[PDB]
């Protein structure tokens, strides 16, 4: 066990723009 699973969300503030992933 070294790596771990974390869904970080993209907001693009600067395009008015944001997603989950």
Known sequence: GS???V???YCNRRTGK???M
């Open 7 to 9: 869904p970080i969300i």
């Open 18 to 20: 944001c997603q989950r």
């Open 3 to 5: 790596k771990k699973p």
